A and B are shown apart, each in its own frame.
Chain A
């Protein structure tokens, strides 16, 4: 990844802040349980 790196280096507020779980990680967590849910 490059855009996140340059945003972090530039100190821009466009880059997201990692206080919440990432969208990809939470999506994987939801899907791995939904596939075994029904």
Chain B
């Protein structure tokens, strides 16, 4: 949607990896079946020993889910943001 030339960078898939890691740390994403914190140490003992599927599948195929719905994004994201128009479908 831009006039052409009469004679915005797409970041590489590698550089996005650091960007992807930040979103999992800040709890915007979460794993598909993330049980989370256990209640007791004995229960956590099993968790620290067991190896789930997500710890072995590749970094680019770990299924996540979202804590914020696009409606809440559109309620919070400033309208001055360029991607505001992409908040909806």
Q: State if A and B touch, Cβ cutoff 8 Å.
A: no
Residues on B facing A (Cβ under 8 Å): none
